[PDB]
Amino acid sequence: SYTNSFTRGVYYPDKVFRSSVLHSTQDLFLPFFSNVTWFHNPVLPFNDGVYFASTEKSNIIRGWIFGTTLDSKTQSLLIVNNATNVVIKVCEFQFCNDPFMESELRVYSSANNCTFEYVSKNLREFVFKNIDGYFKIYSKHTPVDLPQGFSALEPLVDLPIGINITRFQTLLALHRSAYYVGYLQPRTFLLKYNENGTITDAVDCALDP
């Protein structure tokens, strides 16, 4: 199925505080009132950034996997979360074509040449982009098919990898005992800044007259 965003996928273009100032930017955004896929899972494209929301009081969405081939012979990223905490990782892998007591992890079968490690209802939005060897991740967690409202996404991470990306997937926790995908294009927006410095409203300057 397909659904309509209303005003979703706005992130702070960078640091630098700011207050009441209808500031104008050119960047990669998710256009207002867009055609976002619906999923109730397969290899998708990337091609220029990604918006990604989800919802569930339990935690079925357990991270993503990125890259060009999602296997060996070329490098890829892997972002996971067991019931413990997040595990970013960058090796050459061998990924199950369908990768996913409380025993788990049939995700990959190889972890060679690792060049980066790290270890440690609800609506959870994420914006993923990849520029100049940096893989930026913005995110926001707002709690209650999407709804309708405005909520700007704050930067989370920055990874100086160098990795090429052309494809990505998702990871789910099976049964043994809903998510969307937008894409980003170069748009021009007008952001309204509060007096505390938060983005409260926006205007997409390429919709109607």
Binding site: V16, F17, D132, G133, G162
Partner: protein, 244 residues
């Protein structure tokens, strides 16, 4: 506290970090110190993907063989450097550490091998070298030798037969955009005086004053309408300061 033997040398790979060569170069002493691809002075303005650090203990008069385009028992069977080397070799003496009266028989080296080693290749096998035309099937004797000898280090040796600790750094530039590179600075922050300031990149001039605004806890500096920097956050203490 314990270095490796030549025939089985160690190799530590350094990840993306800040590289402080001024701890080893300032150390003062340090034996042989020869740079090849880069100059010894400006390791603090160039930077590479990953640097490797190989460690072993050789004899004194074998340090001349850790160099591109050399031959010998060490540069053929134990540790080879390619002729296009781009790191640097450093070595110092360790007689008071790796030498024992009566003999320190814990440092081995290979001296019999079928063919020369390839650059940066490691061989730790212990099969019996066969010098003649007869098989010996895994037992030494006539024309079959055990390939690993050993230094009997003693403190009453001459320079050239005493133990030297060698560390070889080798740099790597494959394709990565931002990697392990050099470091930066600090300085005390003054206030209420026209000053020339440099906030982790923000270069400017003006009077600095205690603020009463509140950034969000990821914002570094603030801007005005007409886009001029008018507030900063001090990286160390994390307080907002106005710039007039």
């Amino acid at each position: 506290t314990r270095f490796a033997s030549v025939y089985a040398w160690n190799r530590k790979r350094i990840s993306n970090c800040v590289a402080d060569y001024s701890v080893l170069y300032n150390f003062a002493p340090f034996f042989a110190f020869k740079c090849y691809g880069v100059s010894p002075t400006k390791l603090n303005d160039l930077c590479f993907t990953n640097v490797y650090a190989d460690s072993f203990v050789i004899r004194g008069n074998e340090v001349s063989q850790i160099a591109p385009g050399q031959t010998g028992n060490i540069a053929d069977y134990n540790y080879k450097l390619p002729d296009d080397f781009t790191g640097c070799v450093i070595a110092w003496n360790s007689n008071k550490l790796d030498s024992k009266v009566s003999g320190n028989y814990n440092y081995l080296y290979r001296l019999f091998r079928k063919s020369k080693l390839k650059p940066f290749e490691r061989d730790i096998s212990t099969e019996i070298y066969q010098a003649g035309n007869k098989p010996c099937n895994g037992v030494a004797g006539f024309n079959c030798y055990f390939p690993l000898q050993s230094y009997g280090f003693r403190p009453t040796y001459g320079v050239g037969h005493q133990p030297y600790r060698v560390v070889v750094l080798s740099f790597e530039l494959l394709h990565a955009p931002a990697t392990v590179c050099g470091p930066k600075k600090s300085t005390n922050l003054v206030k209420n005086k026209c000053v020339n300031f440099n906030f982790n990149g923000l270069t400017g001039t003006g009077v600095l004053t205690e603020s009463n605004k509140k950034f969000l806890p990821f914002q570094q500096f603030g801007r005005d309408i007409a886009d001029t920097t008018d507030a900063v956050r001090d990286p160390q203490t994390l307080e907002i300061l106005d710039i007039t």
